[PDB]
């Protein structure tokens, strides 16, 4: 079966752990520790195809830049998550953007931005306007999330799957 492997990346707190989680236990999991990271493997029909997704939730905690760009290159996707209520996180996703083009040294990279966090729409710091012109200097498409909701959780991970599928 393909095997398409997914990284999580962004700053702490933005919803890396519960986004995974939510896709791979339909749970919403308020309290996973910040600072572990783990891998997860299911078996997903993608467009008809059984395929195998694996995801790495990235906690942060790798400091060896050569570790964290072996992560990365092992990596065929990636999911770029900020929180549309902390603008910093979405600052920060330009960090990961250039950590990830480094390493795998192709603009097209399988990669979407993800804004999380779309039910605390009255704590909004991160416009959809100027997360979709980011998304569209970096030709990659913008969806907005919810771990808590589920919205566009499935979406994030077949959509990123699918230009794994198209790319590579
Ligand atoms: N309301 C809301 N809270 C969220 C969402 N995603 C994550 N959280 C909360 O934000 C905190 C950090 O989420 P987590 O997934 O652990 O962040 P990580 O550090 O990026 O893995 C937790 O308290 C989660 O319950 C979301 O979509 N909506
Ligand atoms: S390794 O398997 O021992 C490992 C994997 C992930 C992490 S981390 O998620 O805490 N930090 C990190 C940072 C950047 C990229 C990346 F994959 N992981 C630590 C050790
Ligand atoms: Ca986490
Ligand atoms: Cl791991
Ligand atoms: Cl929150």
């Given at each position: 079966?393909?095997?398409?492997?997914?990284?999580?990346?962004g700053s702490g707190g933005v919803?890396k752990?519960?986004?995974?989680?939510?896709?791979?236990?339909?749970?919403?999991?308020?309290?996973?520790?910040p600072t572990?990271?783990?891998?997860?493997?299911?078996?997903?029909?993608?467009?008809?195809?059984?395929?195998?997704?694996?995801?790495?939730?990235?906690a942060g905690?790798?400091?060896?830049?050569?570790?964290?760009?072996?992560?990365?290159?092992?990596?065929?996707?990636?999911?770029?998550?900020?929180?549309?209520?902390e603008?910093?996180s979405?600052?920060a996703?330009?960090?990961?953007?250039?950590?990830?083009?480094?390493?795998?040294?192709?603009?097209?990279?399988?990669?979407?931005?993800?804004?999380?966090?779309?039910?605390?729409?009255?704590?909004?710091?991160?416009?959809?306007?100027?997360?979709?012109?980011?998304?569209?200097?970096?030709?990659?498409?913008?969806?907005?999330?919810?771990?808590?909701?589920?919205?566009?959780?499935?979406?994030?991970?077949?959509?990123?799957?699918?230009?794994?599928?198209?790319?590579?």
């Open positions: 079966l393909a095997l398409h492997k997914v990284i999580m990346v919803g752990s519960a986004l995974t989680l939510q896709f791979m236990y339909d749970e919403f999991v308020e309290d996973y520790e572990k990271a783990d891998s997860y493997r299911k078996k997903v029909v993608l467009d008809g195809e059984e395929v195998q997704i694996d995801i790495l939730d990235t905690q790798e400091d060896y830049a050569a570790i964290r760009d072996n992560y990365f290159r092992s990596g065929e996707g990636f999911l770029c998550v900020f929180s549309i209520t603008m910093e979405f600052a996703t330009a960090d990961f953007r250039e950590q990830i083009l480094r390493v795998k040294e192709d603009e097209n990279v399988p990669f979407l931005l993800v804004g999380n966090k779309s039910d605390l729409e009255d704590k909004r710091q991160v416009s959809v306007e100027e997360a979709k012109n980011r998304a569209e200097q970096w030709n990659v498409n913008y969806v907005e999330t919810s771990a808590k909701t589920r919205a566009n959780v499935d979406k994030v991970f077949f959509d990123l799957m699918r230009e794994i599928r198209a790319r590579l």
